[PDB]
Design a protein around this nucleic acid. Structure first.
Ligand SMILES: [Zn+2]
Length: 2031
RNA sequence: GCUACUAA
């Protein structure tokens, strides 16, 4: 990026400097260094000459020197650069800054002065100031004339390297306040106050009394003093803040020492995990569980592991519906024996008989299905009636009627009372997992499963996934394709998939399942069936299977019993009562399952594939809560047990509680138990990779991947990365929303009331010194607040200004999202009236639904609560957008500034109320959400937001960093430590290491000195705080508001009052919880809920110290940061004692914490400091009121846990798996494209977090599978659109119609779904383009499109383009989307929806809205900027029936079934499809394909229509421009192993609602005026201004009068398509893990491309031309130049690196003339360099050719006193093209380029004795700049570099190679606790030249070739063998020159030239033996043939296989020559 | 609950 020379000198100046005024100048010099750097590279980007601080009076003299500068008055300014074209002078003053505030100042200053001579000379002078952003990198130019000149400018600039120097300078001097004084943009500017008057009540409040009670009396007054302090009044802002700092400095200075001095007190005794410590924990766990749960040893109490019973399919019987129905009927009737429900199952088969009348079932059912398939809506009013067939009364296809005559009254009861459990109505029941005869039973269940499921399907291993994605999986990694087959083949896959396909059909049936009906559900298996019994939503089902022989059935613990029938055996499973939410997951279980297996097995050959799948079905299908209780606690139980410092005992003895209800759970528990002990013995089995560090980051970082560790869930060995996956991944198998709300509300309530009681009874004291639970070290707090509050205001002065802007404090409440959102909200008051009326309605609807059930199968309160509970404070649920509307209409909210309204609300609202609703997430331990009043939301907003922008300043806080941005931060901080550790070790041990190499004589004396030295120590505290919210003093936060400098006194009074009320805040127990406790039935022994509510009197309990979970994150997080800031100071004083160095780095995120400590020792042992660090860690937490959970907290020597994002020893790594398990049931079930959109987004996310392409593609397959399974769009399904459309396969069917996503992953990762459309257009620009222009930019290939011929194209090719233009372009672009008939639902709670009723009811008032909205069309798309505007927007919104539904929650489970059932019904309205073709009702999916073709065939494809596609898609979006370029200019290079992974940021490829108001009326309300100009162009170029008006203007003559509906609906479309153009998208933080650091776009592109090709090897990427094009106005000049630079940089270095010094000019001269780099002649590139204005870059090149003149030297010398003859003399002994002396010791620079580019050279061969330097250029292996790599290289690699034309003495011929020394890589151990070797590049000695390397290679490798090709006991001598050699090398020329043969020839050649036998080799033709007659050149193939067989061969590596293949090839080939398949008639003609 | 008619 930047120059290396200036970096080194600026780094040294930071250490050299001591005083702040010296450090000041280093910051000033760094600005100019960046200033010129931007200018140097931009001048080449614009092709102009570079200049610096050139006077304006001289700039005119270049244009017109006839008038002298004295008489003509020119403005005396100092511009940077100038240009004169088109009779206009353009003045340049480039500058790099974040804001244009510094640019407009210099703009108007220049514009004013330049006008003095602008009218004097009558030549207009334009000011062109170019500014670039130093982080986001965006170009900003003010000149409009300059915009039209340069359409696109190349800006791949690097500031990343500049900020590295800034970090160093603001580290040493950043602590000193003398340096902070010098950096200022106003010193300190405090903005306008948010309030006018203070708060008197705050000083009176009893909580403020209680605050000062505990506090000491000097502190009491200080708090008074601090609040009343105004920062704007006193001379400086830090008057008070420093004053209170200096008071507490007595106790602080002492307490910092106190903690630090404990380093000597410590011992080598810390909570370390050990086999016994784990064992002890388990035993106390057993005791706990055996009390807390009812332990059972009986095998009848178990629950099903899986809720399914699979049995082998029967191919002998027919696979057809009607047949199976009767088959199961007779089968069920035929059941023989006696049980409980035997005669019940018997009659059920009897009630589904058809027999003779099989054909009547085929018709009757098809009529009913056809009746429903006609209508969009369901068939209402008409009564469904059954038809008597044999004994059964069929109601629908596979639906029957329960006939009360066919079953006994007693036998009907048995089935429903006992078996189905309809009418059945104290510890939990669990299985003893410590019983070996229970663990046995559990193991035998697995042994049983493996015995049956391992057996193959025997059916074709070809399903949609493999059929359509197999190709794209296989090419990524062939292993995974096979792995997939291995699964699909095995009964495992058929078992799950048939349960999936069966459940889909169980749900589909269960929807219309009545109370007098039992339904039958069949699957792809013709033995497996299911019976769905009447449900009293709840699905009641049994799996009924007809397995072959007895016990050829899989029972996981689900089966009721097997039964013998009259033909075979039939088994019926226990009645399962599951919920649709659970069942859904079972349907998507195969996708979950495949991923599980593939992820585990991936690239690990030691694992048993049949054992992975054996475990996987029991996970992917496990829907019980038994499993979650294992999967979650395991993650910590393993990691704790393999960490260094960690408390396992306590975690296993308290936090671990198995709920082993099922039988898999028992087996899985013991898998975990065992895995805990294996960890302890593997702690030291972890190794640390050899770190190849050579300045600016490291490649080959992180942990060593060694397969020495042991797996957890199955047998085999595993890698660390894989071990971690096996540890953490299990938890993501867990299922969401399993927690029954009835139980959650109780346990959530109980906990809050338990911890509040704790505080009420036990915790009384607030502050303390000894450090105790819920206590803060008040003196230490106040100081550490003061110190940080200073540094978080000194580093940014406008801090109060930044808060106002970024959080919209000044603007009206109606603008901020958090307030105008559709989130849940709590309303307080009295609703006893409507709450009673809303309840009794449902209590009647209860009886309504019961009355109807009494007729068919006779099986069978809010008033009470209010009457019973006296002190019941009444509340209600509402919406956040609705509350705002309510508070405005009743006028308490206004257009007053939101903060100004907040301040008043803090003092107005005095009592705060909060309610909780459960999340019920995948975790077994349930999480609560506290949601209270809207009034509260406003208060917390300010307090939290003020802390937000404060927290952002501190780099330690990470809640500030949105998205997965933390991952890179982990890395950047880990790398800083790995570097520091090395740097510091080399700085101390250098004195000792010198003596070691000196003596190494006797080695017995060396060990004495090698012991007594410095010792490295790294450690990471992977923390997790205990009860961050509940067990935390809220009183401490009062001080943060008090001490605050950027808060006014009248604000400070008001903030603290609200917080004073947030102590007397009440928790409302929601009614649903109170209803559970309403019906007593004997109360709880010790009822905590009743205790706190006084035997249930009030529904409110007061919560004090427990500030509610998530309400004060940032606030608490700043105090956390302040706490860890102390921990730093503690250790940093402790390590100065021992005399060494320490680097502590703390990452803070509310409750999740990570703190990395790196120490270089001298005195005491490493293990002492380990215990010391942990002591002060808890101390640091507890001195601030927070307590650290030592249970979950673990410490490693590498690993970093932080928010579950993991960084290893530099190498960042997340659990790629967790995101692949999302693409299964994560969608809103809207449409085929709409579903896939989010399912592929989940796959895109995996790639970010370092996922292999092979597995990435799997998710893409699964996603498609589920997507197509939802709407019956799979191959062979109903809506299968391959026959309906013209196409070969689903790759060619548009993804809008649902097909497959045919694109490269490197595109899908970037854009996705749209990629599939983009690839179909790039395919064309690689088919329908000529030989010229195709190799050039994409832009050029788009110009040729309008010169194509339409007739050339094919049916499919035409088909895409027609939809792509007439449909896709304008309409998340979908065409097919099913519409529903859903109802609005109950919207009574809403106030705002009532005001729509009143405006709809009263006549005229409706139209009045729409007529008002037409004069303000800004309020159709965006919400109002003012009260009325926002309010009336809310009412209009209700117009949409979709927005009315949006505020109601539909179950995705129910939504899923509704898209299956409504697929054969008319759902897609064609009206909205045909409208576009023209500019009936709903249409069925099948008909939608037909009716699309009837319209499509009519449309016309032109040479223009196609050119609109290539404009609107490619040429419009600068991103799509580059993506297409990257895939056309792509040149994939060297395949390499993924050694070093690094984090990389996604690059850039680039007023809202107020602008649209200035479009409605052209007058705005200055910068916003300029924004409308480009908006005018957008609407005029597309011409959508007229197109919209014409569409309305001709509709009023179509309809008749004035339709207000069309007046708006068409006007809204016009404003919504504006929104996307006007309101710009925020470039959110996206981090991709790549094989190296991506600085700029091009770098990112190359590394991204190469990461998503193969799994085993990543590839480095090249490009012919620049890929970064900006549009279709910008059509090469800037793409050419850089090629010339690359070329000559490459050549000069290749020449001075490898070619002999003596003959380097000749080489260059030969290369320049007859050669070409990247299809451009090197001469033309040289001419481009010579005609350029940066010749100073290529001084040594120009001198060597004789194209260097004095002007260049004079310029070069002026950039950073010379003569030509001086150079001519000086460089008489320096022979290099990359370097010439331009002084006494100053050499010239050529700037080295990478050597992976030399392949892009194409010229005639240059032969040098024997070597062909062209082939050395074209070589891959022999281009490394490492001596050892080339010395220890293969002869196969070198054998390409030989021609020799009969040379001699190989030693002589190698004279044309560099006899200059090469660079070797040396490595050394670092002497850390995690001991690793650093490897770096040295310069070797002298005898390490390129020649000697080649020679040593030749010698070593030829010796091995000789002994392999002896074929006798002689050698490479003895003509008896030379004859054999001649024979073997003869055939090689008379056969076929493939690739294997030629190598042998050239190797033999080499070997014979070496031995001095190259005076005959060239005169070696076929011997006399083989040649019958010498003259008559006849060949005896038979002889030759038998000669090849008669060759013995050798088995020495590496030639053993080489020779073997050669022989076979040559034999086969020879035999081929003979074998000529002649025509049968041919010979019959000749003779 | 969603639907169709009757009734206050
Ligand atoms: Zn030769």
């Amino acid at each position: 990026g930047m120059d290396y020379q200036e970096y080194q000198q600026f780094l040294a100046r930071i250490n050299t400097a001591r005083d702040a005024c010296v450090a000041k100048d280093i910051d000033v010099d760094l600005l100019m260094a960046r200033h010129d750097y931007f200018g140097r590279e931009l001048c080449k980007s614009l092709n102009i000459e570079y200049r610096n601080d050139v006077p304006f009076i001289d700039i005119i003299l270049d244009i017109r020197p006839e008038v002298d500068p004295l008489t003509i008055d020119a403005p005396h300014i100092t511009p940077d650069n100038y240009l004169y074209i088109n009779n206009v002078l353009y003045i340049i003053d480039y500058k790099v800054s974040v804001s244009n505030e510094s640019s407009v100042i210099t703009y108007d200053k220049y514009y004013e002065l330049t006008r003095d001579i602008s009218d004097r000379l009558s030549i207009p002078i334009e000011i062109v100031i170019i500014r670039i952003d130093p982080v986001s990198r965006d170009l900003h130019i003010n000149s409009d004339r300059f915009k039209e000149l340069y359409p696109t400018i190349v800006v791949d600039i690097n500031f990343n390297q500049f900020f590295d120097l800034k970090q160093l300078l603001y580290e040493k001097f950043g602590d000193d306040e003398e340096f902070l004084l010098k950096v200022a943009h106003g010193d300190f500017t405090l903005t306008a106050p948010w309030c006018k008057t203070g708060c008197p009540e705050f000083w009176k409040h009893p909580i403020y009394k209680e605050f000062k009670m505990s506090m000491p009396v000097p502190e009491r007054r200080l708090f008074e003093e601090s609040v009343k302090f105004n920062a704007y009044e006193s001379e400086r802002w830090n008057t008070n803040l420093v004053k209170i700092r200096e008071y507490t400095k007595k106790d602080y200075s002492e307490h910092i020492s106190k903690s630090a001095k404990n380093i000597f007190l410590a011992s080598g005794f810390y909570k370390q995990p050990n086999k016994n410590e784990i064992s002890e924990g388990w035993t106390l766990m057993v005791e706990r569980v055996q009390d807390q749960r009812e332990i059972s040893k009986s095998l009848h109490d178990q629950k099903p592991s899986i809720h399914f019973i699979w049995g082998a399919h029967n191919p002998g019987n027919s696979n057809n519906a009607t047949f199976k129905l009767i088959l199961l009927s007779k089968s069920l009737q035929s059941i023989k024996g006696i049980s409980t429900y035997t005669e019940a199952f018997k009659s059920l088969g009897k009630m589904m008989d058809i027999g003779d009348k099989a054909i009547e079932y085929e018709e009757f059912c098809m009529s009913l299905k056809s009746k429903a398939r006609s209508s969009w809506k369901q068939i209402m009013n008409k009564k469904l009636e059954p038809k008597q067939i044999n004994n059964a009364l069929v109601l629908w296809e596979q639906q029957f009627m329960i006939n009360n005559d066919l079953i006994d009254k007693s036998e009907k009861l048995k089935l429903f009372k006992n078996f189905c459990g309809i009418g059945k109505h104290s510890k939990p029941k669990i299985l003893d997992f410590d019983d070996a005869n229970m663990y046995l039973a559990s193991l035998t269940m697995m042994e049983q499963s493996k015995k049956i499921l391992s057996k193959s399907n025997g059916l074709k291993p070809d399903n949609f996934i493999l059929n359509e994605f197999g190709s794209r999986i296989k090419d990524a990694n062939k292993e995974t394709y096979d792995n997939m087959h291995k699964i699909f083949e095995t009964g495992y896959w058929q078992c799950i998939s048939d349960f999936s396909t069966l459940m889909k059909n169980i749900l589909s049936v269960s929807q219309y399942n009545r109370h007098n009906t039992f339904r039958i559900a069949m699957c792809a298996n013709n033995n497996v069936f299911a019976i769905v019994f009447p449900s009293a939503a709840t699905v009641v089902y049994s799996i009924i299977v007809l397995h072959k022989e007895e016990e050829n059935i899989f029972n996981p613990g689900c089966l009721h019993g097997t039964f013998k029938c009259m033909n075979g055996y039939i088994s019926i499973s226990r009645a399962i009562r599951l919920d649709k939410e659970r069942c859904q997951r079972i349907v998507s279980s195969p996708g979950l399952f495949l991923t599980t297996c593939l992820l585990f097995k991936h690239d690990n050959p030691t694992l048993v594939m049949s054992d992975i799948m054996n475990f996987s079905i029991y996970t992917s299908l496990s829907i019980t809560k038994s499993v979650l209780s294992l999967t979650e606690p395991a993650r910590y139980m393993i990691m704790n047990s393999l960490a260094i410092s960690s408390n396992v005992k306590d975690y296993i003895a308290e936090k671990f509680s198995p709920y082993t209800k099922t039988l898999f759970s028992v087996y899985m528990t013991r898998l975990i138990k065992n895995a805990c002990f294996d960890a302890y013995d593997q702690r030291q089995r972890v190794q640390l990779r050899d770190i190849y560090l050579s300045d600016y980051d490291i490649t080959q970082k992180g942990i060593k991947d060694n397969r020495e560790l042991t797996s957890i869930w199955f047998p085999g060995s595993v890698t660390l990365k894989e071990y971690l996956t096996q540890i953490y991944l299990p938890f993501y198998f867990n299922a969401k929303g399993l927690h029954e709300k009835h139980h959650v509300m109780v346990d959530l309530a109980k906990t809050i009331l338990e911890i509040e009681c704790e505080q009420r009874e036990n915790i009384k004291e607030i502050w303390s010194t000894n450090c105790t639970k819920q206590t803060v070290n008040l003196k230490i707090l106040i100081h550490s607040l003061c110190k940080n509050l200073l540094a978080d205001t000194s580093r940014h002065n406008h801090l109060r200004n930044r808060i106002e802007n970024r959080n919209n404090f000044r603007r009206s409440i109606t603008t901020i999202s958090t307030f105008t959102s559709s989130k849940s909200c709590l309303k307080i008051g009295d609703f006893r009236k409507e709450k009673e009326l809303q309840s009794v309605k449902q209590k009647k609807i209860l009886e309504v639904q019961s009355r109807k059930m009494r007729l068919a199968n006779p099986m069978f309160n809010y008033e009470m609560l209010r009457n019973a509970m006296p002190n019941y404070t009444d509340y209600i649920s509402t919406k956040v957008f609705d509350r705002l509307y309510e508070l405005l209409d009743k006028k308490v909210l206004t257009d007053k500034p939101v903060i100004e309204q907040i301040m008043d609300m803090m003092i107005d609202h005095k009592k705060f109320y909060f309610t909780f609703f459960n999340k019920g997430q995948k975790t077994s331990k349930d999480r609560e959400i506290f949601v209270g009043e809207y009034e509260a939301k406003m208060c917390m907003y300010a307090v939290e937001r003020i802390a937000k922008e404060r927290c952002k300043l501190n780099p330690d806080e990470m809640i500030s960093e949105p998205g997965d941005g933390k991952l890179k931060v982990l890395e950047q901080k880990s790398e800083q430590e790995i570097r520091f550790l090395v740097e510091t070790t080399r700085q101390k041990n250098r004195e000792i290491d010198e003596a070691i190499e000196a003596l190494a004589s006797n080695l017995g004396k060396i060990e004495k000195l090698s012991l007594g030295k410095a010792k490295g120590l790294k450690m990471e505290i992977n923390a997790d705080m205990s009860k961050w919210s509940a067990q935390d003093v809220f009183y401490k936060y009062f001080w943060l508001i008090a001490l605050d400098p950027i808060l006014y006194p009248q604000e400070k009074e008001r903030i603290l009052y609200f917080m004073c009320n947030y102590m007397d805040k009440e928790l409302i127990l929601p009614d649903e919880l109170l209803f559970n406790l309403l019906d007593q039935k004997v109360a709880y022994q010790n009822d905590i809920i009743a205790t706190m509510t006084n035997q249930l009197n009030s529904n409110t309990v007061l919560i004090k110290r427990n500030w509610l979970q998530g309400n004060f994150n940032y606030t608490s997080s700043y105090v956390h940061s302040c706490a860890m800031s102390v921990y730093k100071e503690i250790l940093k004083e402790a390590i100065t004692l021992l005399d060494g160095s320490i680097l502590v780095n703390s990452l803070v995120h509310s409750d999740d914490n990570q703190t990395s400590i790196t120490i270089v020792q001298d005195k005491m042992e490493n293990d002492k400091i380990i215990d010391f660090a942990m002591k002060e860690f808890e101390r640091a937490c507890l001195t601030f009121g927070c307590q650290a959970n030592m249970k979950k907290t673990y410490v490693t020597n590498c690993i970093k846990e932080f928010v579950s994002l993991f960084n290893l020893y530099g190498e960042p790594f997340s659990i790629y798996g967790r995101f692949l398990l999302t693409s299964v049931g994560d969608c809103a079930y809207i449409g085929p494209y709409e579903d896939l959109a989010s399912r592929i987004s989940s796959a895109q996310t995996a790639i970010k977090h370092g996922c292999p392409p092979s597995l990435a593609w799997v998710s893409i397959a699964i996603s498609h599978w589920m997507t197509s399974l939802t709407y019956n769009m799979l191959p062979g399904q109903s809506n299968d659109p391959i026959d309906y459309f013209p196409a070969e396969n689903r790759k060619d069917i548009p993804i809008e119609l649902n097909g497959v996503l045919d694109a490269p992953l490197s595109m899908i990762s970037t854009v996705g779904l749209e990629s599939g459309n983009l690839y179909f257009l790039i395919k064309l620009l690689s088919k329908y383009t000529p030989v010229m222009q195709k190799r050039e930019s994409v832009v050029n290939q788009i110009a040729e499109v309008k010169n194509w011929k339409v007739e050339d194209l094919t049916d499919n090719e035409i088909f895409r383009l027609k939809i792509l233009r007439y449909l896709v372009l304008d309409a998340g672009r979908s065409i097919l989307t099913p519409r529903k008939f859903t109802t609005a639902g109950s919207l009574r709670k809403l106030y705002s929806f009532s005001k729509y009723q009143d405006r709809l009811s009263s006549p005229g008032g409706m139209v009045e809205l729409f007529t008002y909205l037409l004069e303000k069309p800004e309020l159709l798309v965006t919400k109002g900027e003012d009260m009325k505007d926002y309010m009336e927007s809310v009412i209009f919104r209700y117009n949409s029936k979709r927005f009315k539904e949006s505020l109601s929650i539909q179950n995705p489970a129910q939504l899923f079934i509704e898209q299956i059932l409504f697929s054969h019904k008319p759902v897609i309205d064609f009206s909205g499809i045909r409208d576009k073709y023209i500019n009936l009702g709903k249409v069925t999916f099948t008909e939608a394909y037909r009716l699309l073709m009837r319209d499509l065939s009519s449309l016309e494809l032109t040479n223009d229509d196609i050119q609109v596609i290539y404009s609107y898609i490619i040429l419009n979006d600068p991103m799509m421009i580059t993506i297409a370029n990257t895939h056309i200019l792509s040149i994939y290079g060297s395949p390499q192993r993924r050694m070093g992974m690094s984090c990389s940021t996604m690059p850039e490829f680039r007023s809202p609602a107020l602008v649209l108001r200035a479009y409605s009326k052209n007058n705005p309300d200055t910068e916003m005026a300029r924004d409308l100009v480009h908006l005018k162009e957008f609407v005029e170029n597309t011409n959508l201004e007229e197109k919209m008006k014409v569409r309305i203007a001709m509709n009023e003559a179509e309809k008749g009068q004035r339709d207000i509906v069309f007046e708006l609906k068409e006007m809204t479309r016009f404003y919504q398509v504006c929104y996307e153009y006007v309101k710009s998208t925020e470039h959110k933080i996206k981090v991709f893990i790549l094989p190296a650091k991506s600085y700029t776009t091009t770098d990112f592109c190359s590394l991204m491309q190469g990461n998503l090709i193969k799994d085993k090897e990543w590839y480095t990427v090249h490009y012919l031309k620049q890929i970064l094009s900006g549009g279709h106005k910008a059509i090469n000049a800037t793409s050419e130049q850089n090629i010339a630079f690359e070329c000559f940089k490459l050549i000069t270095h290749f020449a001075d690196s490898f070619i002999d010094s003596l003959s380097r000019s000749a080489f260059l001269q030969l290369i320049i003339d007859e050669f070409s780099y990247k299809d451009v002649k090197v001469s033309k590139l040289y001419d481009i360099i010579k005609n350029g204005y940066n010749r100073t870059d290529f001084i040594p090149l120009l001198f060597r050719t004789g194209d260097l003149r004095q002007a260049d030297l004079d310029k070069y010398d002026a950039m950073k006193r010379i003569l030509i003859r001086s150079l001519d003399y000086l460089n008489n002994d320096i022979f290099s093209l990359s370097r010439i002396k331009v002084g006494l010791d100053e050499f010239a620079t050529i700037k080295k380029a990478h050597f992976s580019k030399m392949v892009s050279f194409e010229g005639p061969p240059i032969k040098t004795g024997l070597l062909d330097l062209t082939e050395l250029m074209k070589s891959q292996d022999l281009l490394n700049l490492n001596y050892d790599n080339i010395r220890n290289s293969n002869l196969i690699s070198f054998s390409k570099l030989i021609c020799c034309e009969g040379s001699d003495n190989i030693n002589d011929g190698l004279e044309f190679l560099s006899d200059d020394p090469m660079n070797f890589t040396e490595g050394e151990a670092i002497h850390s606790t995690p001991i690793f070797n650093i490897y770096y590049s040295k310069r070797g000695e002298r005898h390490m030249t390129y020649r000697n390397a080649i020679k040593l290679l030749i010698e070593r490798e030829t010796k091995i070739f000789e002994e392999a090709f002896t074929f006798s006991e002689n050698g490479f001598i003895s003509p008896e063998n030379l004859g054999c050699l001649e024979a073997v090398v003869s055939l090689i020329k008379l056969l076929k020159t493939n690739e294997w043969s030629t190598v042998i020839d050239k190797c033999i050649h080499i070997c014979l030239i070496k031995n001095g036998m190259d005076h005959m080799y060239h005169s070696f033709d076929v011997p006399k033996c083989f040649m019958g007659n010498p003259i008559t050149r006849d060949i005896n193939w038979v002889m030759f043939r038998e000669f090849i067989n008669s060759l013995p061969g050798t088995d020495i590596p590496p030639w053993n296989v080489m020779t073997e293949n050669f022989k076979k090839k040559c034999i086969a080939l020879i035999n081929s020559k003979f074998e000529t398949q002649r025509d049968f008639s041919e010979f019959t003609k000749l003779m």
